[PDB]
């Protein structure tokens, strides 16, 4: 039972599914939501994140990766701290494509300082 880690970037503009070794120095496969759609607005769609997840899940078979630790992060730090819709699609697809799921953790960068975010004072007048 070979363990890997699946670092998943889930923003509101795009989704990243990224599998590496236990240290992260060596990356196995890395496909994004924008690699599976023809429109920029669909890069973060739940459907796109699912399609990207399958090809990562398909690709991990050849190296014999059987179990994946999953790390979920959003565009944290000087930004939002809520994962995009792509995070849910990836979790379901890996759990169904034939992968064992190990430890699941949130690794969104949490700033204890929070330098000045863009937009203020009145923010985005929309």
């Amino acid at each position: 039972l070979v363990f890997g880690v699946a670092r998943i970037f889930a923003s509101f503009n795009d989704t990243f599914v990224h599998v590496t070794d236990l240290s992260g120095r060596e990356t196995i496969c890395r496909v994004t939501g924008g690699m599976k759609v023809k429109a920029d607005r669909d890069e973060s769609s739940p459907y796109a994140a699912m399609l990207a997840a399958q090809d990562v899940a398909a690709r991990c078979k050849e190296l014999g990766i059987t179990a994946l630790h999953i790390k979920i992060r959003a565009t944290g730090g000087n930004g939002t701290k809520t994962p995009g819709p792509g995070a849910q699609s990836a979790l379901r697809a890996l759990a169904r494509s034939g992968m064992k799921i190990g430890r699941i953790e949130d690794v969104t960068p949490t700033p204890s300082d929070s330098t000045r975010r863009k937009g203020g004072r009145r923010g985005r007048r929309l």
């Binding site: 701290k81 799921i101 929070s114």
Partner: protein
Amino acid sequence: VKKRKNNGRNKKGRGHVKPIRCSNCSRCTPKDKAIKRFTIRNMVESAAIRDISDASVFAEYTVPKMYLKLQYCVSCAIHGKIVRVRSREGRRNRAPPPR
């Protein structure tokens, strides 16, 4: 006309309170004036909880819960339907909605 007894915030006796940034606007608003929601929900949706339990190896794993604190300005909370306009008499009721 004074609409509210507490104006729009809670700083009676505090002088000045450092502002914060709105969650989805980045508006600079005081911390006590802002509308704050503490959300505790499972890191995986209830529909996909079963599949995660299927892939458990290691089948006694409990899915962790995301711990978010969302801070909103008045414009965003109203437009996001977090809070709603209440009647003149119903504005004074400082009780959370029942479950």
